Write a protein that binds this ligand. Structure first.
Ligand code: ZN
Ligand code: ZN
Lengths: 300, 595, 118, 121
């Protein structure tokens, strides 16, 4: 209902919104970003580096290196999906997909490029002792440590780091990414933008696949997005996030046709004191638990 | 045997031209450092100087003070010397913005604006022609004093090819890259090489359509030809060929290795200083950018905005007087300064505007302090740079007259046209007076130029003139450069009978159809009512046989005195000449242009 | 089959500025033809249009000949005498007749799933 | 239409009707006669690290004749490349060798004129 209407209004999206009367306060924001939990890409051609746009710039440095100049390679010879330099055997996939009939399909490495995704001569061009296959294999952390050089690469990898990742490689195919991981790579894309304070983010269960300790950092990021004027909306069951929220809107007592109506709105404490809300019925003791944990720490 | 100038002109020197030519040539040959041609408007200044240069045979730089005047001089000299290298050296400054910062709105104006291909090409054509042949004239804007990389580096780095030399293909293709060429087989443009196995085509930074073609038969170059790009039409058949760097800021590898370290040191120092005085933001900015540039330099021996490191790259002391285009010329080169009374002060101001712009950048951490050493020359360094010099003006400034052994006069025009007569009239009832005179001009199929001191008076006068029934256009103090030509041309066609503006010294206002020029507020304070400005303005009516000047004033200032007296003298001498030759003055006709 | 809601994004957009989504840059001039013919005004917020004005343009003339002259992408004029079909049967027809996975997907965007009536 | 354009690009070494010739040599071929044109890209010596040069020249030559190249050896005979399962002389292709390509219970292997039956009636 909300996202589709806001989208058809703000970005002229064509998705038919759910049945509703009207939506007001539309003048209070310019753009609505729904950071989906759907995958990044549907082919191994897509990866964090591609989705973020890092891989675009990362070809520019290879195209500008000494050997490439004398070899005339440009930002296409090092291109993943371009015949110029990619492994003609795997057609730039790097991994051949085998056909498993009743079992799920399996990805077996290309026996010609050994998974390097480029031909022999393309990876002869070096950048600080490492080639494009090698840098595509690097970890995001190791990548930003490697690209402290270029600020434009750096400020993009930093987003992937702040997000919660930074343990995953630049060239890890999108088809092998967890739903939460994907959602988080998108969160990386929207992370660093000049916020005018008039944009609304929508995240569907960004907790999925995260430890509580990771929930901490992620909440730091999101609350930083809120700090800069923007609005962050989140569909969650995880109480460690719900308690952190400044405003919560609890839906339908029970599910099915027994529901689809507001149980309670307001601050976490205002909803915690609502007996008819299961959410607050499970939130109230968590509010009182950690509140005592802090006073125990503060007194010592 | 030298390649010498061959002046091609349908006419011969006439008037007091031969005497002036003889004087300036004799001066350049005797060894005078400073000379001054006081030439009235209407006489062949460009042609006279062309005669001088043609007679002396020296590499010459001629400086103008804007894109338009430059371009005109280029065209003229290219007509006068078609068999010789007539070169065009401007830069960014012609119509582009430089790197700057505004501490108020917090906006860093990048140097971004892509190096316009034509202009860059012309720059390289110029600098390369300077080393290749002797018969080279280079007209230039003031930009000829800007920061430019060393001549010796630009020289020694050249790939000097000869037929059948002991060279390898890949070696060459690496050397082209060291010098800042790019391979672009898929789009062959200027400053690009293209490999096709054993066919190597190189597009010199100096050329238009003429590209070089080198090949191999083993580890030895066979044939080297001049091919017409994207055609293959063989034009040349050279045995020796030298390919000069595509940038004027390229550097040796060792000198680069050292310079980088020096830059690291200066960066560390300025960083320590910034963080010491609490300017941490600036330190962050500076560190990011400087580190980026440093890595690009460690990688491929260059980056964008490499100019800002020139000094360090030259391994020269901090505060060093930069090398410029002047150094690229031989020792015994010759300088011509057109419209000196404005070009010389403009040259003088170039240092202060640049230093201010760069200092703000250093303050807020956009640059290292060494970026201040990549700058235009100060006037003194320019003075020291001079071998010989000839200033050209109708109204020579203080400096020119001061440093020159008097002046060489050229006052007689080839058509016998005289400097106009001058009427000075009271201010009371000036509008109606000028209106009547204008009506008389209109009856005689003639045009009028009117200059007022202030914009408000200009608009008020335009209104006052439209109501009288007079065809008048207003040349706004800042109107589109292409509309200028339109309105002026339309004045020539007679769509307008009068033209009102504040500054009449801006070019394009030499109109044979103009027989009257009115100068209101002739006695008032301002740059445009000065002696020289007044004479220059008076020179606008000298293009017509019935040319007349009306100054509207209540008093007679010193400037008005000097201007009137000078015009009187010139006019008397010109009528003496015409009497002595049996010449009747008549208006020079000129065809009118279009698109 | 074609959803009426997808054909017009909002029920109040200027028909002069392509109110109907599928017919958007031949068709814009067909709009002009049928509008001329029926007396349907160009500068319009669809919401206020009478139901018949909308029924003609959406569901067809029902056999009645409409005059329709149009300038090709080339520049030449070619007048015809067609029996206008409508905007919806247009979509259904063009989607049904083409055996291309491209054209289909371009027309399916204005269609939705509706339960089998049988 | 050809000889102008490998001359427009700027080649020089070709091989026409077995005889090699210099471009811009006023070359003309007889209309109703067959002609064999083999452009001579690069010519090398086998040494150390000759890879990148070979490489580059191969890419050039292959991009020239639609992924077809002649490697004429000196002392021995000719060698030809083309990449992908295709014939250098007639186009004919087979793509990839998969088991189902040899099965008569699959359209990937079955004969057209009988549908993998092997028996008419
Ligand atoms: Zn492969
Ligand atoms: Zn069979």
């Amino acid at each position: 209902v909300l996202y589709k209407a806001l989208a058809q209004k703000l970005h002229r999206a064509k998705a038919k919104p759910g049945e509703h009367r009207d939506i007001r306060g539309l003048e209070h924001l310019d753009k609505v970003i729904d950071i989906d939990q759907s995958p990044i890409g549907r082919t191994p051609r897509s990866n964090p580096a591609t989705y973020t746009g890092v891989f675009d710039d990362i070809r520019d440095v290879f195209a500008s290196t000494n050997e490439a100049k004398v070899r005339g390679y440009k930002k296409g010879r090092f291109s993943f999906n371009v015949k110029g330099g990619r492994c003609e055997a795997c057609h730039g996939d790097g991994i051949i997909k085998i056909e498993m009939h009743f079992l799920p399909d399996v990805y077996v490495p290309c026996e010609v490029c050994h998974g390097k995704r480029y031909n022999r001569e393309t990876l002869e061009v070096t950048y600080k002792g490492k080639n494009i296959a090698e840098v595509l294999d690097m970890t995001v952390e190791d990548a930003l440590d490697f690209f402290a050089s270029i600020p434009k690469i750096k400020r993009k990898l930093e987003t992937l780091y702040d997000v919660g990742l930074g343990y995953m490689k630049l060239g890890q195919p999108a088809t092998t990414l967890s739903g939460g991981e994907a959602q988080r790579v998108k969160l990386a894309a929207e992370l660093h933008r000049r916020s005018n304070g008039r944009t609304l983010y929508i995240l569907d269960e960004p907790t999925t696949g995260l430890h509580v300790d990771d929930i901490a950092r992620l909440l730091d990021v999101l609350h930083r997005l809120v700090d800069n004027g923007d609005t962050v909306l989140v569909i969650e069951h995880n109480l460690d996030v719900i308690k952190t929220a400044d405003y919560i809107i609890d839906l339908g007592p029970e599910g099915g046709d027994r529901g689809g109506q507001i149980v309670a709105v307001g601050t976490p404490e205002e909803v915690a004191e609502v007996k008819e809300s299961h959410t607050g019925r499970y939130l109230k003791p968590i509010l009182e638990r950690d509140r005592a944990r802090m006073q125990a720490r503060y007194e010592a | 045997v030298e390649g010498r100038f061959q002046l091609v002109s349908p006419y011969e020197p006439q008037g007091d031209q031969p005497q002036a030519i003889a004087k300036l040539v004799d001066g350049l040959r005797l060894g005078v450092k400073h000379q001054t041609l006081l030439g009235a408007t209407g006489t062949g200044k460009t042609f006279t100087i062309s005669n001088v240069i043609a007679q002396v045979n020296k590499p010459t730089l001629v400086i103008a003070h804007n894109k338009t005047l430059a371009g005109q001089l280029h065209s003229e000299l290219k007509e006068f010397f078609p068999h010789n290298a007539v070169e065009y050296f401007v830069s960014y400054y012609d119509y582009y913005q430089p790197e700057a910062y505004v501490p108020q709105t917090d906006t860093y104006i990048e140097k971004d604006a892509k190096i316009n291909d034509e202009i860059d090409k012309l720059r390289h054509s110029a600098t390369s022609a300077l080393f290749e042949r002797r018969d080279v004239i280079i007209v230039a804007s003031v930009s000829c004093i800007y920061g430019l990389g060393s001549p010796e580096e630009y020289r020694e780095l050249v790939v000097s090819l000869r037929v059948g030399m002991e060279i390898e293909r890949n070696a060459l293709l690496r050397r082209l890259v060291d010098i800042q060429y790019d391979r672009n087989d898929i789009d062959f443009r200027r400053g690009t090489f293209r490999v096709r196995g054993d066919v190597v085509e190189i597009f010199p930074a100096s050329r238009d359509e003429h590209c070089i073609r080198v090949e191999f038969f083993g580890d030895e170059i066979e044939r080297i030809r001049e091919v017409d790009a994207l055609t293959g039409e063989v034009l040349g058949e050279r045995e020796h060929v030298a390919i000069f760097p595509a940038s004027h800021f390229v550097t040796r590898e060792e000198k680069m290795r050292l310079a980088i370290q020096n830059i690291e040191q200066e960066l560390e120092e300025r960083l320590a200083e910034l963080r010491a005085q609490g300017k941490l933001l600036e330190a962050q900015r500076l560190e990011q950018r400087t580190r980026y540039d440093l890595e690009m330099m460690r990688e491929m021996g260059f980056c964008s905005g490499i100019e800002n490191y020139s000094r360090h790259l030259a391994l020269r002391p901090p505060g060093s007087t930069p090398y410029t285009l002047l150094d690229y010329f031989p020792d015994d080169f010759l300088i011509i300064v057109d419209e000196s009374h404005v070009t010389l002060p403009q040259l003088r101001g170039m240092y202060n505007g640049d230093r201010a712009r760069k200092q703000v950048l250093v303050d807020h951490g956009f640059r290292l302090p060494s970026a201040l050493d990549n700058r235009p020359l100060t006037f003194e360094e320019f003075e020291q740079k001079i071998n010989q010099i000839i200033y050209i003006s109708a109204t020579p400034g203080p400096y020119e007259l001061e440093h020159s052994p008097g002046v060489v006069e050229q006052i007689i025009r080839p058509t016998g046209l005289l400097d106009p007569t001058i009427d000075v009239r009271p201010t009371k009832g000036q509008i109606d007076d000028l209106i009547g005179e204008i009506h008389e001009r209109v009856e005689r199929n003639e045009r009028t130029l009117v200059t007022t001191l202030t914009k408000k008076m200009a608009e008020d006068l335009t209104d006052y003139l439209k109501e009288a029934g007079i065809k008048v256009a207003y040349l706004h103090s800042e109107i589109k450069t292409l509309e200028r030509i339109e309105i002026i041309r339309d004045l020539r066609l007679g769509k307008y009978d009068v033209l009102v503006g504040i500054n009449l010294l801006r070019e394009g206002l030499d109109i044979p159809e103009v027989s009257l020029v009115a100068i209101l507020d002739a006695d008032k304070e301002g740059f445009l009512r000065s002696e020289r400005s007044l004479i220059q303005t008076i020179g606008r009516a000298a293009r017509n046989a019935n040319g007349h000047v009306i100054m509207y004033a209540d008093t007679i200032t010193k400037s008005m005195e000097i201007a009137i007296q000078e015009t009187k003298r010139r006019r008397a001498i010109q009528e003496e000449y015409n009497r002595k030759h049996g010449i009747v003055p008549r208006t020079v006709k000129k065809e009118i242009r279009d698109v | 089959e074609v959803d009426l809601d997808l054909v017009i994004p909002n029920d109040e957009l200027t028909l002069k500025e392509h109110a109907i989504a599928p017919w958007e840059p031949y068709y814009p001039q067909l709009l002009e033809a049928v509008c001329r013919h029926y007396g349907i005004p160009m500068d319009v917020p669809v919401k206020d249009l009478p139901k018949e004005q909308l029924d003609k343009i959406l569901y067809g003339s029902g056999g009645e000949p409409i005059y329709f002259r149009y300038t090709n992408d080339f520049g030449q004029v070619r007048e015809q005498y067609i029996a206008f079909e409508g905007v919806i049967p247009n979509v259904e027809r063009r989607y049904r007749e083409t055996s291309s996975d491209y054209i289909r997907e371009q027309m399916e965007k204005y269609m939705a799933e509706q339960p089998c009536p049988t | 239409k050809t000889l102008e354009d490998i001359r427009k690009q700027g080649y020089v070494r070709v091989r026409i009707d077995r005889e090699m010739r210099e471009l811009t040599g006023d070359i003309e071929l007889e209309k109703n006669k067959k002609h064999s044109i083999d452009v001579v890209v690069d010519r090398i010596i086998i040494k150390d690290g000759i890879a990148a040069r070979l490489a580059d020249s191969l890419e050039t030559a292959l991009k020239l004749a639609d992924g077809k190249v002649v490697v004429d050896v000196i002392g021995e005979g000719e060698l030809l490349f083309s990449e992908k399962h295709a014939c250098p002389y007639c186009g004919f292709s087979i793509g990839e060798l998969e088991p189902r390509l040899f099965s008569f219970n699959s359209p990937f292997g079955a004969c057209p004129d009988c549908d993998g039956l092997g028996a008419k009636l």
